[PDB]
């Protein structure tokens, strides 16, 4: 009956240049399975392929996000949301683009 | 003729507890494709699944390493090596376990 906890992630506090290969990982630490992991960008759900963003479920507790070529469209607050029977958690990181 | 360049990564400032979920993304920035991306732990090569370490080539310029459940055996220097026909490059991060 353990609720999900998530390790912090960050694109870095320095703005990113267009064309860079950037990414973060949503790694659930403690938490009962089954767990669902999902993403939003500026509160809109994003899934693999949307806006050129790669999102891949590496394991039941890890989601990998990769932006192969950063654009100004990718600017904003990325949120990972992890949910199971016992509770839910989210953590965020703002991507800044020069 | 452009050799691979790699964004630095880190498991973090602080030592990690046993059982935690840790990982890094090796994201090549500059460099002509195709690029071979491989990993070592304390100078010895790692393959997907070895010592419970997940390794996945996510894209032509990104490789993801995940340790689903960290043990003290995972202690040491993780190196990502990126190679093409032009040249090679690497970046590292030391994983510490309490």
PDB file of N, CA, C and O in Angstrom, chain A residues 7 19-29 54 56 58-59 61-62 64-66 68, chain B residues 7 19-29 54 56 58-59 61-62 64-66 68:
ATOM      1  N   UNK A   7      11.969  10.726  -8.036  1.00  0.00           N
ATOM      2  CA  UNK A   7      13.242  11.436  -7.952  1.00  0.00           C
ATOM      3  C   UNK A   7      13.146  12.747  -8.724  1.00  0.00           C
ATOM      4  O   UNK A   7      12.468  12.815  -9.751  1.00  0.00           O
ATOM      5  N   UNK A  19      17.958  23.103 -31.142  1.00  0.00           N
ATOM      6  CA  UNK A  19      18.714  22.059 -31.808  1.00  0.00           C
ATOM      7  C   UNK A  19      19.444  21.120 -30.864  1.00  0.00           C
ATOM      8  O   UNK A  19      19.956  20.081 -31.284  1.00  0.00           O
ATOM      9  N   UNK A  20      19.502  21.476 -29.586  1.00  0.00           N
ATOM     10  CA  UNK A  20      20.181  20.626 -28.614  1.00  0.00           C
ATOM     11  C   UNK A  20      19.412  19.336 -28.362  1.00  0.00           C
ATOM     12  O   UNK A  20      18.195  19.281 -28.525  1.00  0.00           O
ATOM     13  N   UNK A  21      20.145  18.297 -27.976  1.00  0.00           N
ATOM     14  CA  UNK A  21      19.561  17.026 -27.572  1.00  0.00           C
ATOM     15  C   UNK A  21      19.369  17.030 -26.058  1.00  0.00           C
ATOM     16  O   UNK A  21      20.331  16.898 -25.300  1.00  0.00           O
ATOM     17  N   UNK A  22      18.128  17.210 -25.618  1.00  0.00           N
ATOM     18  CA  UNK A  22      17.849  17.348 -24.190  1.00  0.00           C
ATOM     19  C   UNK A  22      16.882  16.279 -23.705  1.00  0.00           C
ATOM     20  O   UNK A  22      16.164  15.671 -24.500  1.00  0.00           O
ATOM     21  N   UNK A  23      16.862  16.054 -22.393  1.00  0.00           N
ATOM     22  CA  UNK A  23      15.990  15.042 -21.833  1.00  0.00           C
ATOM     23  C   UNK A  23      15.992  14.939 -20.320  1.00  0.00           C
ATOM     24  O   UNK A  23      16.902  15.416 -19.634  1.00  0.00           O
ATOM     25  N   UNK A  24      14.949  14.302 -19.804  1.00  0.00           N
ATOM     26  CA  UNK A  24      14.828  14.015 -18.384  1.00  0.00           C
ATOM     27  C   UNK A  24      14.241  12.625 -18.206  1.00  0.00           C
ATOM     28  O   UNK A  24      13.771  12.010 -19.165  1.00  0.00           O
ATOM     29  N   UNK A  25      14.262  12.141 -16.972  1.00  0.00           N
ATOM     30  CA  UNK A  25      13.736  10.823 -16.672  1.00  0.00           C
ATOM     31  C   UNK A  25      12.811  10.887 -15.461  1.00  0.00           C
ATOM     32  O   UNK A  25      13.115  11.560 -14.474  1.00  0.00           O
ATOM     33  N   UNK A  26      11.673  10.210 -15.542  1.00  0.00           N
ATOM     34  CA  UNK A  26      10.778  10.143 -14.398  1.00  0.00           C
ATOM     35  C   UNK A  26      10.952   8.797 -13.719  1.00  0.00           C
ATOM     36  O   UNK A  26      10.402   7.790 -14.161  1.00  0.00           O
ATOM     37  N   UNK A  27      11.739   8.783 -12.648  1.00  0.00           N
ATOM     38  CA  UNK A  27      12.077   7.538 -11.983  1.00  0.00           C
ATOM     39  C   UNK A  27      11.359   7.432 -10.648  1.00  0.00           C
ATOM     40  O   UNK A  27      11.674   8.149  -9.689  1.00  0.00           O
ATOM     41  N   UNK A  28      10.378   6.539 -10.606  1.00  0.00           N
ATOM     42  CA  UNK A  28       9.621   6.283  -9.393  1.00  0.00           C
ATOM     43  C   UNK A  28      10.486   5.488  -8.428  1.00  0.00           C
ATOM     44  O   UNK A  28      11.108   4.497  -8.812  1.00  0.00           O
ATOM     45  N   UNK A  29      10.546   5.941  -7.181  1.00  0.00           N
ATOM     46  CA  UNK A  29      11.388   5.293  -6.189  1.00  0.00           C
ATOM     47  C   UNK A  29      10.584   4.252  -5.426  1.00  0.00           C
ATOM     48  O   UNK A  29      10.577   3.081  -5.794  1.00  0.00           O
ATOM     49  N   UNK A  54      10.070  12.531 -27.583  1.00  0.00           N
ATOM     50  CA  UNK A  54      10.113  11.093 -27.346  1.00  0.00           C
ATOM     51  C   UNK A  54       9.785  10.782 -25.888  1.00  0.00           C
ATOM     52  O   UNK A  54      10.352  11.379 -24.976  1.00  0.00           O
ATOM     53  N   UNK A  56       9.241   7.211 -23.538  1.00  0.00           N
ATOM     54  CA  UNK A  56       9.333   5.755 -23.568  1.00  0.00           C
ATOM     55  C   UNK A  56       9.281   5.132 -22.176  1.00  0.00           C
ATOM     56  O   UNK A  56      10.027   5.531 -21.279  1.00  0.00           O
ATOM     57  N   UNK A  58      10.473   2.657 -19.960  1.00  0.00           N
ATOM     58  CA  UNK A  58      11.654   1.812 -19.884  1.00  0.00           C
ATOM     59  C   UNK A  58      11.414   0.632 -18.938  1.00  0.00           C
ATOM     60  O   UNK A  58      11.906  -0.480 -19.161  1.00  0.00           O
ATOM     61  N   UNK A  59      10.643   0.886 -17.886  1.00  0.00           N
ATOM     62  CA  UNK A  59      10.305  -0.130 -16.897  1.00  0.00           C
ATOM     63  C   UNK A  59       8.993   0.288 -16.238  1.00  0.00           C
ATOM     64  O   UNK A  59       8.510   1.388 -16.496  1.00  0.00           O
ATOM     65  N   UNK A  61       8.602   1.431 -13.478  1.00  0.00           N
ATOM     66  CA  UNK A  61       8.849   2.565 -12.593  1.00  0.00           C
ATOM     67  C   UNK A  61       9.681   3.686 -13.217  1.00  0.00           C
ATOM     68  O   UNK A  61      10.046   4.647 -12.532  1.00  0.00           O
ATOM     69  N   UNK A  62       9.970   3.582 -14.509  1.00  0.00           N
ATOM     70  CA  UNK A  62      10.794   4.594 -15.169  1.00  0.00           C
ATOM     71  C   UNK A  62      10.248   5.008 -16.537  1.00  0.00           C
ATOM     72  O   UNK A  62      10.047   4.174 -17.427  1.00  0.00           O
ATOM     73  N   UNK A  64      11.232   7.596 -19.674  1.00  0.00           N
ATOM     74  CA  UNK A  64      12.307   8.378 -20.259  1.00  0.00           C
ATOM     75  C   UNK A  64      11.764   9.401 -21.249  1.00  0.00           C
ATOM     76  O   UNK A  64      11.035   9.044 -22.173  1.00  0.00           O
ATOM     77  N   UNK A  65      12.119  10.667 -21.059  1.00  0.00           N
ATOM     78  CA  UNK A  65      11.720  11.710 -21.997  1.00  0.00           C
ATOM     79  C   UNK A  65      12.942  12.280 -22.698  1.00  0.00           C
ATOM     80  O   UNK A  65      13.898  12.719 -22.055  1.00  0.00           O
ATOM     81  N   UNK A  66      12.899  12.281 -24.024  1.00  0.00           N
ATOM     82  CA  UNK A  66      13.986  12.834 -24.813  1.00  0.00           C
ATOM     83  C   UNK A  66      13.469  13.760 -25.903  1.00  0.00           C
ATOM     84  O   UNK A  66      12.543  13.418 -26.645  1.00  0.00           O
ATOM     85  N   UNK A  68      14.874  15.169 -29.116  1.00  0.00           N
ATOM     86  CA  UNK A  68      16.010  14.951 -30.012  1.00  0.00           C
ATOM     87  C   UNK A  68      16.578  16.258 -30.552  1.00  0.00           C
ATOM     88  O   UNK A  68      17.787  16.395 -30.721  1.00  0.00           O
TER      89      UNK A  68
ATOM     90  N   UNK B   7      26.639  15.624 -23.771  1.00  0.00           N
ATOM     91  CA  UNK B   7      26.189  16.382 -22.611  1.00  0.00           C
ATOM     92  C   UNK B   7      26.517  15.607 -21.339  1.00  0.00           C
ATOM     93  O   UNK B   7      26.271  14.403 -21.259  1.00  0.00           O
ATOM     94  N   UNK B  19      18.385  -0.109  -3.149  1.00  0.00           N
ATOM     95  CA  UNK B  19      17.001  -0.319  -3.528  1.00  0.00           C
ATOM     96  C   UNK B  19      16.406   0.814  -4.343  1.00  0.00           C
ATOM     97  O   UNK B  19      15.311   0.683  -4.888  1.00  0.00           O
ATOM     98  N   UNK B  20      17.120   1.931  -4.430  1.00  0.00           N
ATOM     99  CA  UNK B  20      16.615   3.077  -5.179  1.00  0.00           C
ATOM    100  C   UNK B  20      16.695   2.854  -6.687  1.00  0.00           C
ATOM    101  O   UNK B  20      17.386   1.954  -7.167  1.00  0.00           O
ATOM    102  N   UNK B  21      15.973   3.694  -7.420  1.00  0.00           N
ATOM    103  CA  UNK B  21      15.902   3.634  -8.874  1.00  0.00           C
ATOM    104  C   UNK B  21      16.719   4.780  -9.458  1.00  0.00           C
ATOM    105  O   UNK B  21      16.318   5.938  -9.374  1.00  0.00           O
ATOM    106  N   UNK B  22      17.874   4.455 -10.029  1.00  0.00           N
ATOM    107  CA  UNK B  22      18.786   5.479 -10.521  1.00  0.00           C
ATOM    108  C   UNK B  22      19.053   5.304 -12.005  1.00  0.00           C
ATOM    109  O   UNK B  22      18.921   4.204 -12.550  1.00  0.00           O
ATOM    110  N   UNK B  23      19.426   6.394 -12.662  1.00  0.00           N
ATOM    111  CA  UNK B  23      19.685   6.337 -14.088  1.00  0.00           C
ATOM    112  C   UNK B  23      20.218   7.628 -14.668  1.00  0.00           C
ATOM    113  O   UNK B  23      20.163   8.680 -14.029  1.00  0.00           O
ATOM    114  N   UNK B  24      20.745   7.533 -15.887  1.00  0.00           N
ATOM    115  CA  UNK B  24      21.229   8.687 -16.635  1.00  0.00           C
ATOM    116  C   UNK B  24      20.946   8.517 -18.125  1.00  0.00           C
ATOM    117  O   UNK B  24      20.776   7.388 -18.603  1.00  0.00           O
ATOM    118  N   UNK B  25      20.882   9.637 -18.844  1.00  0.00           N
ATOM    119  CA  UNK B  25      20.788   9.620 -20.301  1.00  0.00           C
ATOM    120  C   UNK B  25      22.089  10.124 -20.882  1.00  0.00           C
ATOM    121  O   UNK B  25      22.545  11.216 -20.534  1.00  0.00           O
ATOM    122  N   UNK B  26      22.677   9.343 -21.782  1.00  0.00           N
ATOM    123  CA  UNK B  26      23.839   9.796 -22.536  1.00  0.00           C
ATOM    124  C   UNK B  26      23.357  10.423 -23.833  1.00  0.00           C
ATOM    125  O   UNK B  26      22.962   9.722 -24.767  1.00  0.00           O
ATOM    126  N   UNK B  27      23.370  11.748 -23.885  1.00  0.00           N
ATOM    127  CA  UNK B  27      22.821  12.456 -25.031  1.00  0.00           C
ATOM    128  C   UNK B  27      23.920  13.135 -25.833  1.00  0.00           C
ATOM    129  O   UNK B  27      24.508  14.125 -25.399  1.00  0.00           O
ATOM    130  N   UNK B  28      24.197  12.576 -27.003  1.00  0.00           N
ATOM    131  CA  UNK B  28      25.180  13.142 -27.911  1.00  0.00           C
ATOM    132  C   UNK B  28      24.632  14.428 -28.523  1.00  0.00           C
ATOM    133  O   UNK B  28      23.475  14.484 -28.941  1.00  0.00           O
ATOM    134  N   UNK B  29      25.457  15.468 -28.555  1.00  0.00           N
ATOM    135  CA  UNK B  29      25.054  16.735 -29.150  1.00  0.00           C
ATOM    136  C   UNK B  29      25.581  16.830 -30.581  1.00  0.00           C
ATOM    137  O   UNK B  29      24.888  16.477 -31.535  1.00  0.00           O
ATOM    138  N   UNK B  54      19.985  -1.797 -16.856  1.00  0.00           N
ATOM    139  CA  UNK B  54      19.320  -1.641 -18.147  1.00  0.00           C
ATOM    140  C   UNK B  54      20.051  -0.635 -19.033  1.00  0.00           C
ATOM    141  O   UNK B  54      20.408   0.455 -18.591  1.00  0.00           O
ATOM    142  N   UNK B  56      19.653   1.002 -23.044  1.00  0.00           N
ATOM    143  CA  UNK B  56      18.848   1.063 -24.261  1.00  0.00           C
ATOM    144  C   UNK B  56      19.233   2.227 -25.164  1.00  0.00           C
ATOM    145  O   UNK B  56      19.276   3.381 -24.729  1.00  0.00           O
ATOM    146  N   UNK B  58      18.062   4.744 -27.298  1.00  0.00           N
ATOM    147  CA  UNK B  58      16.751   5.363 -27.441  1.00  0.00           C
ATOM    148  C   UNK B  58      16.566   6.010 -28.813  1.00  0.00           C
ATOM    149  O   UNK B  58      15.452   6.093 -29.332  1.00  0.00           O
ATOM    150  N   UNK B  59      17.667   6.471 -29.392  1.00  0.00           N
ATOM    151  CA  UNK B  59      17.633   7.167 -30.670  1.00  0.00           C
ATOM    152  C   UNK B  59      19.028   7.079 -31.280  1.00  0.00           C
ATOM    153  O   UNK B  59      19.932   6.531 -30.648  1.00  0.00           O
ATOM    154  N   UNK B  61      21.164   9.215 -31.330  1.00  0.00           N
ATOM    155  CA  UNK B  61      22.090  10.043 -30.564  1.00  0.00           C
ATOM    156  C   UNK B  61      21.866  10.007 -29.052  1.00  0.00           C
ATOM    157  O   UNK B  61      22.379  10.863 -28.325  1.00  0.00           O
ATOM    158  N   UNK B  62      21.112   9.027 -28.571  1.00  0.00           N
ATOM    159  CA  UNK B  62      20.832   8.952 -27.141  1.00  0.00           C
ATOM    160  C   UNK B  62      20.790   7.517 -26.633  1.00  0.00           C
ATOM    161  O   UNK B  62      20.126   6.656 -27.220  1.00  0.00           O
ATOM    162  N   UNK B  64      20.152   5.342 -22.924  1.00  0.00           N
ATOM    163  CA  UNK B  64      19.645   5.464 -21.558  1.00  0.00           C
ATOM    164  C   UNK B  64      20.104   4.318 -20.664  1.00  0.00           C
ATOM    165  O   UNK B  64      19.958   3.147 -21.014  1.00  0.00           O
ATOM    166  N   UNK B  65      20.646   4.657 -19.501  1.00  0.00           N
ATOM    167  CA  UNK B  65      21.046   3.648 -18.531  1.00  0.00           C
ATOM    168  C   UNK B  65      20.127   3.735 -17.318  1.00  0.00           C
ATOM    169  O   UNK B  65      19.859   4.823 -16.815  1.00  0.00           O
ATOM    170  N   UNK B  66      19.632   2.587 -16.865  1.00  0.00           N
ATOM    171  CA  UNK B  66      18.780   2.534 -15.681  1.00  0.00           C
ATOM    172  C   UNK B  66      19.187   1.407 -14.747  1.00  0.00           C
ATOM    173  O   UNK B  66      19.454   0.288 -15.183  1.00  0.00           O
ATOM    174  N   UNK B  68      17.351  -0.381 -11.932  1.00  0.00           N
ATOM    175  CA  UNK B  68      16.015  -0.489 -11.351  1.00  0.00           C
ATOM    176  C   UNK B  68      16.036  -0.594  -9.826  1.00  0.00           C
ATOM    177  O   UNK B  68      15.197  -0.001  -9.145  1.00  0.00           O
TER     178      UNK B  68
END
